[PDB]
Protein backbone atom coordinates (compact mmCIF):
# COMPACT_ATOMS: atom_id res chain seq x y z
CA UNK A 1 0.00 0.00 0.00
CA UNK A 2 1.55 3.12 -0.96
CA UNK A 3 0.28 6.89 -0.29
CA UNK A 4 0.30 9.09 -3.18
CA UNK A 5 -3.06 9.73 -5.45
CA UNK A 6 -4.35 12.98 -7.16
CA UNK A 7 -7.13 12.11 -9.23
CA UNK A 8 -10.04 13.14 -6.91
CA UNK A 9 -11.79 10.18 -8.39
CA UNK A 10 -11.29 7.38 -5.91
CA UNK A 11 -11.00 3.87 -8.24
CA UNK A 12 -9.92 1.68 -5.40
CA UNK A 13 -12.63 -1.28 -4.07
CA UNK A 14 -12.50 -3.59 -0.93
CA UNK A 15 -11.56 -7.08 -1.93
CA UNK A 16 -12.07 -9.30 1.25
CA UNK A 17 -12.49 -12.90 1.77
CA UNK A 18 -9.27 -13.64 -0.61
CA UNK A 19 -7.87 -16.99 -0.46
CA UNK A 20 -4.26 -18.06 1.13
CA UNK A 21 -3.39 -18.55 -2.32
CA UNK A 22 -4.22 -15.62 -4.07
CA UNK A 23 -1.56 -12.76 -4.57
CA UNK A 24 -0.89 -9.34 -6.18
CA UNK A 25 -0.40 -11.21 -9.80
CA UNK A 26 -3.43 -13.16 -9.31
CA UNK A 27 -5.92 -10.15 -8.07
CA UNK A 28 -5.02 -8.14 -11.15
CA UNK A 29 -4.92 -11.30 -13.75
CA UNK A 30 -8.31 -11.73 -12.73
CA UNK A 31 -9.16 -7.59 -12.43
CA UNK A 32 -7.26 -6.48 -15.50
CA UNK A 33 -10.70 -8.01 -17.46
CA UNK A 34 -13.19 -5.23 -15.77
CA UNK A 35 -10.60 -2.47 -16.79
CA UNK A 36 -6.89 -1.99 -16.01
CA UNK A 37 -5.27 -2.26 -12.41
CA UNK A 38 -3.46 0.54 -11.59
CA UNK A 39 -2.41 -0.31 -7.97
CA UNK A 40 -2.78 -3.19 -5.66
CA UNK A 41 -3.29 -2.56 -1.95
CA UNK A 42 -2.97 -5.94 0.55
CA UNK A 43 -3.14 -5.85 4.24
CA UNK A 44 -0.59 -8.05 6.07
CA UNK A 45 1.94 -8.12 8.71
CA UNK A 46 4.97 -7.62 8.08
CA UNK A 47 6.48 -9.84 9.87
CA UNK A 48 4.58 -12.74 8.14
CA UNK A 49 4.82 -10.89 4.72
CA UNK A 50 1.53 -12.33 3.29
CA UNK A 51 -1.68 -11.14 2.58
CA UNK A 52 -3.80 -12.91 5.15
CA UNK A 53 -6.85 -12.92 2.66
CA UNK A 54 -8.46 -9.32 2.55
CA UNK A 55 -7.48 -5.64 0.72
CA UNK A 56 -8.26 -2.98 -1.92
CA UNK A 57 -6.97 -2.29 -5.43
CA UNK A 58 -6.90 0.36 -7.53
CA UNK A 59 -7.85 0.98 -11.15
CA UNK A 60 -7.89 3.00 -13.88
CA UNK A 61 -11.15 4.04 -14.26
CA UNK A 62 -13.82 4.82 -11.51
CA UNK A 63 -16.10 2.31 -13.95
CA UNK A 64 -14.08 -0.81 -13.02
CA UNK A 65 -14.92 -0.18 -9.84
CA UNK A 66 -18.27 -0.37 -10.08
CA UNK A 67 -18.42 -3.81 -12.43
CA UNK A 68 -16.08 -5.13 -9.61
CA UNK A 69 -18.48 -4.07 -7.17
CA UNK A 70 -21.88 -5.34 -8.89
CA UNK A 71 -20.61 -8.49 -9.36
CA UNK A 72 -19.42 -8.69 -5.52
CA UNK A 73 -18.06 -11.93 -6.22
CA UNK A 74 -15.53 -13.44 -7.78
CA UNK A 75 -13.36 -16.92 -8.99
CA UNK A 76 -10.16 -16.57 -8.04
CA UNK A 77 -8.11 -19.85 -7.99
CA UNK A 78 -11.78 -21.92 -6.97
CA UNK A 79 -12.46 -19.56 -4.21
CA UNK A 80 -15.26 -16.95 -3.77
CA UNK A 81 -13.48 -13.14 -3.33
CA UNK A 82 -15.81 -10.71 -2.03
CA UNK A 83 -15.70 -6.64 -3.66
CA UNK A 84 -17.21 -4.18 -2.37
CA UNK A 85 -16.83 -0.53 -3.10
CA UNK A 86 -14.10 1.28 -1.38
CA UNK A 87 -14.17 4.84 -0.18
CA UNK A 88 -11.00 7.31 0.12
CA UNK A 89 -9.38 7.58 3.87
CA UNK A 90 -5.87 8.94 4.65
CA UNK A 91 -4.21 10.25 7.89
CA UNK A 92 -1.95 13.60 6.47
CA UNK A 93 -2.55 16.80 7.19
CA UNK A 94 -0.98 20.42 5.91
CA UNK A 95 1.52 22.41 8.12
CA UNK A 96 2.28 26.19 8.71
CA UNK A 97 5.88 25.34 9.07
CA UNK A 98 8.44 23.43 11.52
CA UNK A 99 6.65 23.29 15.32
Not at 19 to 27: A, F, I, K, S, Y
Amino acid sequence: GSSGSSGSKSNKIFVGGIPHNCGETELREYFKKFGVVTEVVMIYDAEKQRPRGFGFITFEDEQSVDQAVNMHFHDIMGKKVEVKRAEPRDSKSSGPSSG
